[PDB]
Coordinates of C-alpha atoms and ligand atoms in Angstrom, one line a residue:
Chain A
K1 CA -13.4 -7.3 -4.5
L2 CA -15.4 -8.3 -1.4
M3 CA -12.2 -9.4 0.6
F4 CA -12.9 -12.3 3.7
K5 CA -11.7 -11.9 7.0
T6 CA -8.2 -13.2 7.4
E7 CA -5.8 -12.8 10.3
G8 CA -3.8 -10.1 11.2
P9 CA -3.7 -6.4 10.1
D10 CA -6.3 -5.6 7.6
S11 CA -3.6 -3.5 5.8
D12 CA -5.1 -4.0 2.2
Chain B
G1 CA 22.7 -7.9 3.1
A2 CA 22.3 -4.1 4.1
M3 CA 21.6 -5.0 7.5
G4 CA 24.6 -7.1 7.9
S5 CA 26.4 -4.4 10.1
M6 CA 23.6 -3.9 12.8
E7 CA 23.4 -5.7 15.7
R8 CA 20.2 -8.0 16.0
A9 CA 19.0 -5.9 18.9
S10 CA 19.3 -2.7 17.5
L11 CA 17.2 -4.3 14.2
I12 CA 14.6 -5.7 17.0
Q13 CA 14.5 -2.2 18.2
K14 CA 14.4 -0.1 15.1
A15 CA 11.6 -2.7 13.8
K16 CA 9.3 -1.5 16.8
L17 CA 10.1 1.9 16.2
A18 CA 9.1 1.7 12.6
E19 CA 6.1 0.0 13.8
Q20 CA 5.3 3.1 16.0
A21 CA 6.2 5.3 13.0
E22 CA 4.0 3.5 10.3
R23 CA 6.8 2.9 8.4
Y24 CA 6.2 -1.0 7.4
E25 CA 8.7 -1.2 5.0
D26 CA 11.7 -0.1 7.2
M27 CA 9.8 -2.6 9.7
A28 CA 10.1 -5.5 7.3
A29 CA 13.7 -4.5 5.9
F30 CA 14.8 -4.5 9.8
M31 CA 12.9 -8.0 10.6
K32 CA 14.6 -9.6 7.6
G33 CA 18.1 -8.2 8.8
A34 CA 17.4 -9.7 12.0
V35 CA 16.0 -13.3 10.5
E36 CA 19.5 -13.3 8.3
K37 CA 21.5 -13.2 11.8
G38 CA 20.4 -16.9 11.7
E39 CA 19.4 -16.8 15.4
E40 CA 16.0 -18.5 16.0
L41 CA 13.2 -15.6 16.7
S42 CA 11.1 -15.6 20.1
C43 CA 7.1 -15.3 20.0
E44 CA 7.1 -11.2 20.1
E45 CA 10.0 -11.3 16.9
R46 CA 8.0 -13.7 14.9
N47 CA 4.9 -11.3 15.6
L48 CA 7.1 -8.3 14.3
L49 CA 8.0 -10.1 11.1
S50 CA 4.8 -11.2 10.5
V51 CA 2.9 -7.6 10.9
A52 CA 5.9 -5.7 9.0
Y53 CA 5.5 -8.2 5.8
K54 CA 1.4 -8.5 6.3
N55 CA 1.4 -4.5 6.1
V56 CA 3.8 -4.3 2.9
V57 CA 2.0 -7.2 0.7
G58 CA -1.3 -5.6 2.3
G59 CA -0.8 -2.6 0.1
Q60 CA 0.7 -4.5 -2.9
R61 CA -2.5 -6.5 -2.9
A62 CA -4.8 -3.5 -2.8
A63 CA -3.4 -1.7 -5.2
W64 CA -3.2 -5.0 -7.4
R65 CA -6.9 -5.2 -7.1
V66 CA -7.7 -1.7 -7.9
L67 CA -5.5 -2.0 -11.2
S68 CA -7.0 -5.4 -12.1
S69 CA -10.9 -4.1 -11.8
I70 CA -9.6 -1.0 -14.3
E71 CA -7.7 -3.3 -16.4
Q72 CA -10.9 -5.7 -16.7
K73 CA -13.3 -2.6 -17.3
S74 CA -11.0 -1.6 -19.9
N75 CA -11.5 -5.0 -21.5
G76 CA -3.3 1.4 -24.6
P77 CA -1.1 -0.7 -23.2
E78 CA -0.7 1.8 -19.6
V79 CA -3.0 -0.2 -17.5
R80 CA -1.6 -3.9 -18.1
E81 CA 1.7 -2.3 -17.7
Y82 CA 1.1 -0.9 -14.5
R83 CA -0.7 -3.7 -13.0
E84 CA 2.3 -6.4 -14.2
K85 CA 4.8 -3.5 -12.5
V86 CA 2.5 -3.7 -9.2
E87 CA 2.4 -7.5 -9.3
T88 CA 6.0 -8.1 -10.1
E89 CA 6.6 -5.9 -7.0
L90 CA 4.2 -8.2 -4.9
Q91 CA 5.7 -11.4 -6.4
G92 CA 9.6 -10.3 -5.1
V93 CA 7.8 -9.5 -1.3
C94 CA 6.2 -13.2 -1.7
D95 CA 9.5 -14.8 -2.5
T96 CA 11.6 -12.6 -0.2
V97 CA 9.1 -14.2 2.6
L98 CA 9.1 -17.7 1.4
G99 CA 13.1 -17.3 1.2
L100 CA 13.2 -16.3 4.9
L101 CA 10.8 -19.2 5.8
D102 CA 12.9 -21.5 3.7
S103 CA 16.1 -19.8 4.7
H104 CA 16.0 -21.4 7.8
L105 CA 12.9 -20.6 9.7
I106 CA 10.8 -23.2 9.5
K107 CA 13.7 -26.2 9.6
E108 CA 15.0 -24.6 12.9
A109 CA 11.5 -24.5 14.2
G110 CA 10.7 -27.4 16.6
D111 CA 8.1 -26.0 19.1
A112 CA 4.4 -26.2 17.9
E113 CA 4.0 -22.2 18.2
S114 CA 6.8 -21.6 16.4
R115 CA 6.5 -24.1 13.3
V116 CA 2.7 -23.7 13.1
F117 CA 3.3 -20.0 12.8
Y118 CA 5.8 -20.1 10.2
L119 CA 4.0 -23.1 8.2
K120 CA 0.8 -20.8 8.2
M121 CA 2.6 -17.8 7.2
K122 CA 4.1 -20.2 4.1
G123 CA 0.3 -21.0 2.7
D124 CA -0.4 -17.2 3.3
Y125 CA 2.2 -16.1 0.9
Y126 CA 1.7 -18.8 -1.5
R127 CA -2.2 -17.6 -1.2
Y128 CA -1.3 -14.2 -2.3
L129 CA 0.7 -15.5 -5.3
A130 CA -2.1 -17.6 -6.1
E131 CA -4.1 -14.4 -6.0
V132 CA -2.3 -13.1 -9.1
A133 CA -1.5 -16.4 -10.8
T134 CA -2.6 -17.1 -14.3
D135 CA 1.9 -22.9 -12.8
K136 CA -1.3 -21.4 -10.7
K137 CA -2.2 -24.9 -9.9
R138 CA 1.0 -25.9 -8.2
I139 CA 1.1 -22.5 -6.5
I140 CA -2.5 -23.2 -4.9
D141 CA -0.9 -26.8 -4.3
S142 CA 2.3 -25.2 -2.4
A143 CA -0.4 -23.0 -0.4
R144 CA -2.4 -26.0 0.4
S145 CA 0.6 -28.5 1.5
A146 CA 1.6 -25.8 3.8
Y147 CA -1.7 -25.2 5.7
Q148 CA -2.5 -28.7 5.7
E149 CA 1.0 -29.6 7.4
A150 CA 0.7 -26.4 9.9
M151 CA -3.5 -27.9 10.4
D152 CA -1.9 -31.3 11.2
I153 CA 0.3 -30.1 14.0
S154 CA -1.9 -27.9 15.4
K155 CA -4.5 -30.4 16.2
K156 CA -2.0 -32.7 17.7
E157 CA 0.0 -29.8 19.6
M158 CA -2.0 -26.8 20.6
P159 CA -5.6 -26.6 22.3
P160 CA -8.4 -25.5 20.2
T161 CA -8.3 -22.0 21.7
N162 CA -4.8 -21.3 20.7
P163 CA -4.8 -18.0 18.5
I164 CA -2.2 -19.3 16.2
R165 CA -4.4 -22.8 15.5
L166 CA -7.5 -20.3 15.2
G167 CA -5.5 -17.7 12.6
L168 CA -4.7 -20.6 10.6
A169 CA -8.0 -22.3 10.5
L170 CA -9.3 -18.7 9.6
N171 CA -6.6 -18.3 6.8
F172 CA -7.1 -21.6 5.7
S173 CA -10.8 -21.2 5.1
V174 CA -10.5 -18.7 3.1
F175 CA -8.1 -20.3 1.1
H176 CA -10.6 -23.2 0.4
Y177 CA -13.6 -20.9 -0.3
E178 CA -12.0 -18.3 -2.8
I179 CA -8.6 -19.9 -4.2
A180 CA -9.3 -23.6 -4.0
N181 CA -13.1 -23.2 -5.5
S182 CA -14.2 -25.1 -2.4
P183 CA -16.9 -23.1 -0.4
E184 CA -18.4 -25.9 1.4
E185 CA -14.8 -26.9 2.7
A186 CA -14.7 -23.4 3.9
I187 CA -17.8 -23.4 6.0
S188 CA -17.1 -26.8 7.5
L189 CA -13.7 -26.0 8.3
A190 CA -14.8 -22.5 10.2
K191 CA -17.8 -24.2 11.6
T192 CA -16.0 -26.8 13.1
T193 CA -13.5 -24.4 14.5
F194 CA -15.5 -22.2 16.0
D195 CA -17.6 -24.9 18.0
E196 CA -14.5 -26.4 19.1
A197 CA -12.9 -23.0 20.4
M198 CA -16.3 -22.0 22.0
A199 CA -16.1 -25.5 24.0
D200 CA -12.4 -24.9 25.4
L201 CA -13.3 -21.1 26.3
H202 CA -13.9 -22.3 29.9
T203 CA -10.1 -23.3 30.3
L204 CA -8.7 -19.8 30.0
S205 CA -8.0 -16.4 31.6
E206 CA -9.7 -13.3 31.0
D207 CA -6.7 -12.6 28.7
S208 CA -6.7 -15.4 26.9
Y209 CA -10.2 -15.5 26.5
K210 CA -10.2 -11.9 24.7
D211 CA -7.6 -13.2 22.5
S212 CA -9.4 -16.5 21.3
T213 CA -12.8 -15.0 20.9
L214 CA -11.1 -12.1 18.6
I215 CA -10.2 -14.4 16.0
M216 CA -13.4 -16.3 16.8
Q217 CA -15.5 -13.3 15.8
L218 CA -13.6 -13.4 12.3
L219 CA -14.5 -17.1 11.7
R220 CA -18.2 -15.9 12.6
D221 CA -18.1 -12.9 10.3
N222 CA -17.0 -15.1 7.3
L223 CA -19.9 -17.7 7.7
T224 CA -21.9 -14.9 8.0
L225 CA -21.3 -13.9 4.6
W226 CA -20.8 -17.3 3.2
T227 CA -24.7 -18.6 4.5
Chain C
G1 CA 16.2 8.8 -15.4
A2 CA 14.2 5.5 -14.8
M3 CA 11.1 7.2 -16.9
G4 CA 13.4 8.7 -19.7
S5 CA 11.9 6.0 -21.8
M6 CA 8.0 6.3 -21.3
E7 CA 5.8 8.4 -23.2
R8 CA 5.0 11.9 -21.4
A9 CA 1.1 10.9 -21.9
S10 CA 1.8 7.2 -20.7
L11 CA 3.6 9.0 -17.7
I12 CA 0.7 11.3 -16.6
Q13 CA -1.7 8.1 -17.2
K14 CA 0.0 5.6 -15.1
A15 CA 0.4 8.8 -12.6
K16 CA -3.5 9.2 -12.0
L17 CA -3.4 5.2 -12.0
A18 CA -1.0 5.3 -9.2
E19 CA -3.6 7.9 -7.0
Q20 CA -6.4 5.4 -7.6
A21 CA -4.2 2.9 -6.1
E22 CA -2.7 5.0 -3.4
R23 CA 0.7 4.1 -4.8
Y24 CA 2.0 7.5 -4.2
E25 CA 5.5 7.1 -4.4
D26 CA 4.9 5.3 -7.7
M27 CA 2.5 8.6 -8.6
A28 CA 5.3 11.0 -7.5
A29 CA 8.1 9.1 -10.2
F30 CA 5.8 9.1 -12.9
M31 CA 5.3 13.1 -12.3
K32 CA 9.4 13.8 -12.1
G33 CA 9.1 11.6 -15.1
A34 CA 6.6 14.0 -16.8
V35 CA 8.6 17.0 -15.3
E36 CA 11.9 16.1 -16.8
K37 CA 10.0 15.5 -20.3
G38 CA 10.8 19.6 -20.3
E39 CA 7.5 20.7 -21.5
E40 CA 5.3 23.0 -19.1
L41 CA 2.7 21.5 -16.9
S42 CA -1.1 22.1 -17.3
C43 CA -3.2 22.8 -14.3
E44 CA -4.3 19.2 -13.9
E45 CA -0.6 17.9 -14.4
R46 CA 0.6 20.8 -11.8
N47 CA -2.0 19.3 -9.1
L48 CA -0.8 15.3 -9.7
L49 CA 2.5 16.8 -9.0
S50 CA 1.6 18.4 -6.2
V51 CA -0.9 15.5 -4.5
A52 CA 1.8 12.5 -5.4
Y53 CA 4.8 14.7 -3.5
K54 CA 2.4 16.2 -0.6
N55 CA 1.3 12.3 0.2
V56 CA 4.9 11.2 0.1
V57 CA 6.5 13.8 2.4
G58 CA 3.2 13.8 4.5
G59 CA 4.3 10.0 5.5
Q60 CA 7.7 11.0 6.2
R61 CA 6.5 14.2 8.4
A62 CA 4.9 12.2 10.1
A63 CA 7.1 9.3 10.7
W64 CA 9.9 12.3 11.7
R65 CA 7.5 13.6 14.3
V66 CA 7.0 10.2 16.1
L67 CA 10.4 9.7 16.3
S68 CA 11.4 13.4 17.5
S69 CA 8.9 12.5 20.4
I70 CA 10.3 9.4 21.3
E71 CA 13.9 10.8 21.1
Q72 CA 13.1 13.7 23.1
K73 CA 11.3 11.3 25.7
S74 CA 14.6 9.2 25.6
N75 CA 16.8 12.0 26.6
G76 CA 21.5 3.6 23.0
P77 CA 21.8 5.4 19.8
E78 CA 19.3 3.6 17.8
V79 CA 16.4 6.0 18.5
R80 CA 18.4 9.0 17.1
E81 CA 20.2 7.2 14.2
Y82 CA 16.4 5.9 13.0
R83 CA 14.9 9.6 13.1
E84 CA 18.2 10.7 11.3
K85 CA 17.6 8.1 8.6
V86 CA 14.0 8.9 8.3
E87 CA 15.1 13.0 8.1
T88 CA 17.3 12.0 5.5
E89 CA 15.1 10.2 3.5
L90 CA 12.8 13.6 4.1
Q91 CA 15.6 16.0 3.2
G92 CA 16.0 14.0 0.2
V93 CA 12.3 14.2 -1.3
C94 CA 12.3 18.1 -0.5
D95 CA 15.5 18.1 -2.7
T96 CA 14.2 16.2 -5.3
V97 CA 10.7 18.9 -5.5
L98 CA 12.7 21.9 -5.1
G99 CA 15.4 20.3 -7.9
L100 CA 12.3 20.4 -10.3
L101 CA 10.8 23.7 -9.4
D102 CA 14.4 25.0 -10.1
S103 CA 14.8 22.9 -13.2
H104 CA 12.7 24.5 -14.9
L105 CA 9.0 24.7 -13.8
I106 CA 9.5 28.4 -12.3
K107 CA 11.7 29.7 -14.8
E108 CA 9.1 28.8 -17.8
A109 CA 6.0 29.6 -15.4
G110 CA 4.7 33.0 -17.0
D111 CA 0.9 32.8 -16.0
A112 CA 0.2 34.0 -12.6
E113 CA -2.0 30.5 -11.7
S114 CA 1.4 28.3 -12.8
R115 CA 3.8 31.0 -11.2
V116 CA 2.1 31.2 -7.7
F117 CA 1.5 27.6 -7.8
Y118 CA 5.3 26.6 -7.8
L119 CA 6.6 29.4 -5.7
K120 CA 3.9 28.3 -2.8
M121 CA 5.4 24.6 -3.7
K122 CA 9.0 26.1 -3.0
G123 CA 7.8 27.8 -0.1
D124 CA 6.4 24.7 1.6
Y125 CA 9.2 22.4 0.5
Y126 CA 11.8 24.9 2.2
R127 CA 9.0 24.9 5.1
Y128 CA 9.6 21.2 5.4
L129 CA 13.5 21.4 5.3
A130 CA 12.9 24.0 8.2
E131 CA 10.7 21.8 10.3
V132 CA 13.8 19.0 10.7
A133 CA 16.5 21.9 10.4
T134 CA 18.7 22.6 13.9
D135 CA 21.8 26.7 8.2
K136 CA 17.9 26.6 9.6
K137 CA 18.0 30.7 9.8
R138 CA 18.8 30.5 6.1
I139 CA 16.5 27.5 5.3
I140 CA 13.5 29.7 6.7
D141 CA 14.5 32.8 4.5
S142 CA 14.6 30.7 1.3
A143 CA 10.9 29.6 2.5
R144 CA 9.7 33.1 3.4
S145 CA 11.0 34.5 0.1
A146 CA 9.5 32.2 -1.9
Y147 CA 6.2 33.0 -0.4
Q148 CA 6.7 36.4 -0.5
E149 CA 7.5 36.6 -4.0
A150 CA 3.9 34.3 -4.9
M151 CA 2.0 36.5 -2.4
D152 CA 3.1 39.8 -4.2
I153 CA 2.0 38.3 -7.7
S154 CA -1.0 36.5 -6.4
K155 CA -2.4 40.0 -4.8
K156 CA -2.0 41.9 -8.5
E157 CA -2.7 38.8 -10.8
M158 CA -5.8 36.9 -8.7
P159 CA -9.2 37.5 -7.0
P160 CA -8.9 37.1 -3.5
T161 CA -11.0 33.9 -3.6
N162 CA -8.4 32.2 -6.3
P163 CA -8.1 28.9 -4.3
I164 CA -4.3 29.1 -5.3
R165 CA -4.1 32.4 -3.6
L166 CA -6.0 31.5 -0.8
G167 CA -3.9 27.8 -0.3
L168 CA -0.8 30.1 -0.4
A169 CA -1.9 32.5 2.3
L170 CA -3.2 29.4 4.4
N171 CA 0.4 28.0 4.3
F172 CA 1.9 31.1 4.7
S173 CA 0.0 32.0 7.7
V174 CA 1.1 28.5 9.2
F175 CA 4.7 29.4 8.3
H176 CA 4.7 32.4 10.3
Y177 CA 2.8 30.8 13.3
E178 CA 5.3 27.9 13.8
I179 CA 8.7 28.0 11.7
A180 CA 9.0 32.0 12.0
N181 CA 8.1 32.4 15.6
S182 CA 5.1 35.5 14.5
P183 CA 1.9 34.5 15.5
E184 CA 0.6 38.0 15.3
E185 CA 1.6 37.9 11.3
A186 CA -0.2 34.5 11.0
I187 CA -3.6 35.8 12.5
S188 CA -3.6 39.3 10.6
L189 CA -2.8 37.1 7.5
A190 CA -5.5 34.6 7.9
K191 CA -8.0 37.2 8.9
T192 CA -7.2 39.7 5.9
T193 CA -7.3 36.7 3.9
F194 CA -10.6 35.3 4.8
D195 CA -12.5 39.0 5.1
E196 CA -11.0 39.9 1.3
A197 CA -12.4 36.3 0.1
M198 CA -15.7 36.6 2.1
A199 CA -16.5 40.3 0.3
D200 CA -15.5 38.5 -3.2
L201 CA -17.8 35.2 -3.0
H202 CA -20.8 37.5 -4.8
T203 CA -18.8 36.8 -8.1
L204 CA -18.7 33.0 -7.9
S205 CA -20.7 30.7 -9.7
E206 CA -21.5 27.5 -7.6
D207 CA -19.0 25.6 -8.4
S208 CA -15.8 28.3 -7.7
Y209 CA -17.8 29.1 -4.6
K210 CA -17.5 25.6 -3.2
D211 CA -13.7 25.3 -3.9
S212 CA -13.2 28.9 -2.2
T213 CA -15.5 28.1 0.6
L214 CA -13.3 24.7 1.7
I215 CA -10.0 26.4 1.7
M216 CA -11.6 29.4 3.7
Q217 CA -12.9 27.3 6.4
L218 CA -9.1 25.9 7.0
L219 CA -8.4 29.8 7.5
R220 CA -11.2 29.7 10.1
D221 CA -10.0 26.4 11.8
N222 CA -6.5 27.7 12.3
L223 CA -7.9 31.2 13.6
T224 CA -10.2 29.0 15.9
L225 CA -7.0 27.2 17.2
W226 CA -4.9 30.4 17.3
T227 CA -7.4 32.8 19.2
Chain D
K1 CA 2.6 17.8 17.9
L2 CA -0.5 19.7 17.2
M3 CA -0.6 20.3 13.4
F4 CA -2.1 23.6 11.9
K5 CA -4.4 23.4 8.4
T6 CA -2.3 23.5 5.8
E7 CA -3.7 23.4 2.1
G8 CA -3.8 19.7 0.3
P9 CA -3.7 16.3 1.4
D10 CA -3.7 16.0 5.2
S11 CA -1.2 13.0 4.3
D12 CA 1.0 13.7 7.8
Ligands
LIG301 N1 2.2 -5.6 16.7 C1 3.2 -6.2 17.3 N2 4.3 -5.3 17.7 C2 2.6 -7.3 18.2 C3 1.8 -8.4 18.1 C4 2.0 -9.5 19.0 C5 0.8 -10.4 19.4 C6 -0.9 -9.9 19.4 C7 -1.7 -10.6 19.5 C8 -1.3 -12.1 19.7 C9 0.1 -12.7 19.9 C10 0.8 -11.8 19.8 C11 3.0 -9.4 19.8 C12 3.5 -10.2 20.9 C13 4.1 -11.4 21.1 N3 4.2 -11.4 22.4 C14 4.6 -10.6 22.8 N4 4.0 -9.1 22.0 S1 4.1 -8.0 19.2
LIG302 N1 10.1 -18.7 -3.2 C1 9.7 -19.4 -3.5 N2 9.8 -20.6 -2.6 C2 8.8 -19.5 -4.5 C3 8.6 -18.4 -5.4 C4 7.7 -18.9 -6.6 C5 7.3 -17.6 -7.6 C6 5.6 -17.3 -8.3 C7 5.3 -16.4 -8.9 C8 6.0 -15.5 -9.3 C9 7.6 -15.4 -8.6 C10 8.1 -16.4 -7.9 C11 7.3 -19.8 -6.7 C12 6.6 -20.7 -7.8 C13 6.3 -22.2 -7.6 N3 5.6 -22.5 -8.8 C14 6.0 -21.2 -9.6 N4 6.9 -20.3 -8.9 S1 8.1 -20.7 -5.6
LIG303 N1 -5.8 14.5 -7.0 C1 -6.2 14.9 -8.1 N2 -6.0 14.3 -9.1 C2 -6.4 16.5 -8.3 C3 -6.6 17.8 -7.8 C4 -7.1 18.7 -8.7 C5 -7.6 19.9 -8.4 C6 -8.5 19.9 -7.1 C7 -9.2 21.3 -6.4 C8 -8.9 22.2 -7.2 C9 -7.8 22.6 -8.0 C10 -7.4 21.3 -9.0 C11 -7.3 18.4 -9.9 C12 -7.6 19.2 -11.3 C13 -7.1 20.4 -11.8 N3 -7.7 20.8 -13.0 C14 -8.1 19.6 -13.1 N4 -8.1 18.6 -12.3 S1 -6.9 17.0 -10.3
LIG304 N1 17.2 21.8 -3.5 C1 17.8 22.9 -3.1 N2 17.6 24.3 -3.5 C2 18.2 22.9 -1.5 C3 18.1 21.8 -0.6 C4 18.9 22.2 0.6 C5 18.9 21.0 2.1 C6 18.9 21.5 3.2 C7 18.6 20.2 4.0 C8 19.2 19.1 3.8 C9 19.4 18.7 2.1 C10 19.1 19.9 1.3 C11 19.6 23.4 0.5 C12 19.8 24.1 1.7 C13 19.6 25.6 2.1 N3 20.3 25.7 3.0 C14 20.8 24.8 3.3 N4 20.7 23.9 2.7 S1 19.1 24.2 -0.7
LIG305 CA1 4.5 1.0 -15.3
LIG306 CA1 18.7 3.4 10.6
LIG307 MG1 -8.4 -7.4 4.4
LIG308 MG1 15.1 -24.7 17.3
LIG309 MG1 5.5 29.5 -20.4
LIG310 MG1 -1.5 17.7 8.4

């Protein structure tokens, strides 16, 4: 999936 | 729980060690133990709690998407069973975090910086449940409700460059885009948030400026993908 | 154990899914369940078992070194306690793997490709115990004993380009260098292994050539650091 | 620590 930009560690 | 016998200060020190060691499951268990001491958390401690669980649920979400894709392509019970195993473990981490927020972090959080931070987290962990839900409407409304309460407080009590306010708006805009199927609301929120921050940057020191522009760049990155 | 009720074929399929999902603890538990079915493992299944546990113990070793460094710099009990917690979990993974090799993978392994693979693994997991040991002499000798038996069989039964033979020699050379404090033995073994492989490459297809040269490049990388 | 080059996943 294209994941959008959420706040904090990009851990996924 | 298992951390009941360890000093609060020892749990926080070991959370910071676990972070250095990239031991995020340990980091989360140490911070859960610190929260269960019943004292309010400092700004640093709230960030330790958030980073720990974000790393844990991030592993689970990434795994779930890999397995869901295989499952969708495959349409034996094994792919479904294993996707269901990961999904249940993810739901349990979300339920654990929502448990800490409701017992009793939110109710004792009176300052805007604590209360918005915890209500953003409550929105984020309902959003993670919504990502795997297929009750889905009620989970989405729980996420929306938490985000909206955090937004109302942030707009009254925090400057538009406040990094907590910015991260909240970023995450609420992504909620609108891909959970609530409201791409126009997502774009509007991201643009208004970016523009109001831009106009407040003049007030900031070099260090606050760097913290605010980093999150504003994530809003721009999304707007570039969405428009 | 917990995997007693799942089909062997289902455990192997879920190990491969867990690998795709980067869920290495799950992958290891599925492969432990497959081994405990009591049948010998195929070449693919042996590699699944090895990759799963290598990823798990690799996380633990990396964490242990971070914590040991902090502990050495610090010379409160917290750093020692947390390093000891990670060390015990690492020892338990090594004891679990050595348990599978001794019950009963090694004793039923008659072909050179299976028997060398499992004796190399036994050497590797004793080496990981030796890395944290401070009985240390007896653990080092257990590692040496396993590696030497694997080497004797590999030299009699496998061509010098055989990737299992090459990986064995690579790992035994690193055992000599930094566990046995025998840097000259490490260099001699790495050079002889590289040179004998080089002279057998002519016999190989394009696909076998690529598999052998990849491990020969790791021998060269070490020799470059050691000389 | 400088880790040397062992066979398989470089997981540490
Ligand atoms: N990963 C971590 N240990 C931290 C992240 C942040 C943070 C980072 C950026 C912005 C706000 C907080 C911490 C912190 C807060 N107040 C003192 N430090 S600690
Ligand atoms: N800890 C919490 N407050 C909740 C967890 C879950 C849940 C959701 C999915 C799976 C397991 C638990 C909630 C819920 C709301 N609607 C339906 N389920 S509320
Ligand atoms: N990570 C994995 N699933 C694998 C690694 C290897 C392997 C890779 C390189 C060399 C030898 C084996 C596998 C395999 C063996 N025989 C069929 N496949 S499966
Ligand atoms: N499963 C196995 N065969 C072993 C595990 C350990 C061990 C080593 C360290 C910690 C826990 C277990 C062994 C051992 C050999 N000398 C002393 N301890 S033998
Ligand atoms: Ca399963
Ligand atoms: Ca501990
Ligand atoms: Mg992400
Ligand atoms: Mg208070
Ligand atoms: Mg046999
Ligand atoms: Mg390594």
